[PDB]
Each structure stands twice: as C-alpha cells, then as structure tokens.
C-alpha cells in the first residue's frame, strides 16, 4: 500500500486531530482485537491440529504398528 | 521531511484513555502470541522429549525381541 499525504494546502484543530484519529485508533484496535481473536483461535486451532496429528500418529498408528509386530514375534 | 519555516483536549484525553485499553488489547495480543508461539513450540516438541525417551526404550525392546 502507498497512502498520499497530498491535499494539505495551508490548537483546537490540533487537539481535534489528536482526538479524531484516536476516536479512529480505539477503532482500528477494537478491529485489531477482533482480528486477534481470529489469531487466538488460529493458534488454539494450530495446537489442536498439531495435537490431532500426535493423536493419530501415536494412538492408533505407532502403538498399533509396534505391538502388531510384537504379537507376531 | 526537512521543513525550514481544552474541550477538544478533553475528547483527546478520554480517547487516549480508551486507546490505552486498545493498546492493552494489542499488547495482550503480543503476550498471547509470545506465550502461544512458545506453546505451539512446546506441543510440537514434548512428544519428541519425554515420550521422546520412553518410546525409544519401547522401540529398543522390539529390536531386542527379534
């Protein structure tokens, strides 16, 4: 992305812009905590989808694959 | 950029107080990621550590059985 600062053709309006952009920065960061909710579920779902592969890899496969050869011996 | 030449402050104080909660959320994201990138790395490792020795004796006694 590339935002232009063009259009600026020259203290209440200083403090109004310190307000207005931060009435718009609680804003972007309320939107960010709702995106970061998506990151929290993406991380908890990533531990879940690693643990689900450790589950499948150990429980039925690897422990079955071993004791099915010991039972053959 | 080489430049060579209180009401709406109450609205900016109250919204710097709210942007401070929203920076608490974006710094709690940064702490949630700090812990959870350690937690994904502990989960993607702990079956390679603790079970990563017990499953190696479990296998060496199969190699010992043949």
């Amino acid at each position: 992305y590339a935002s232009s600062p063009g259009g600026v053709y020259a203290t209440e309006f200083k403090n109004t812009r310190t307000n207005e952009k931060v009435e718009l920065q609680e804003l972007n960061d309320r939107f960010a905590n709702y995106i970061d909710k998506v990151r929290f579920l993406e991380q908890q779902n990533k531990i879940l989808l690693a643990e689900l592969e450790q589950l499948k890899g150990q429980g039925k496969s690897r422990l079955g694959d071993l004791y099915e050869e010991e039972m053959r011996e | 950029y080489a430049s060579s030449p209180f009401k709406n402050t109450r609205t900016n104080e109250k919204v710097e107080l709210q942007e401070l909660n929203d920076r608490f959320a974006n710094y709690i994201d940064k702490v949630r990621f700090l812990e959870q990138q350690n937690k994904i790395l502990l989960a993607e490792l702990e079956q390679l550590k603790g079970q990563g020795k017990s499953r190696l004796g479990d296998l060496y006694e199969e190699e010992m059985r043949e």
């Binding site: 718009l24 609680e26 309320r30 | 919204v15």
Partner: peptide, 22 residues
Amino acid sequence: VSKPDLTAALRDVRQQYESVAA
C-alpha cells in the same frame, strides 16, 4: 469477538461533555 469498530466517540463526547460542564 466483542466488540468492533467504534465505542470511543459516543463515550468520549459524553465524558468530554461531563468534563466540559466543569
């Protein structure tokens, strides 16, 4: 998920109007 985008300007214009009464 709680909430989005905006609570500031309705909270701020009120707490500003309280601070502005003084």
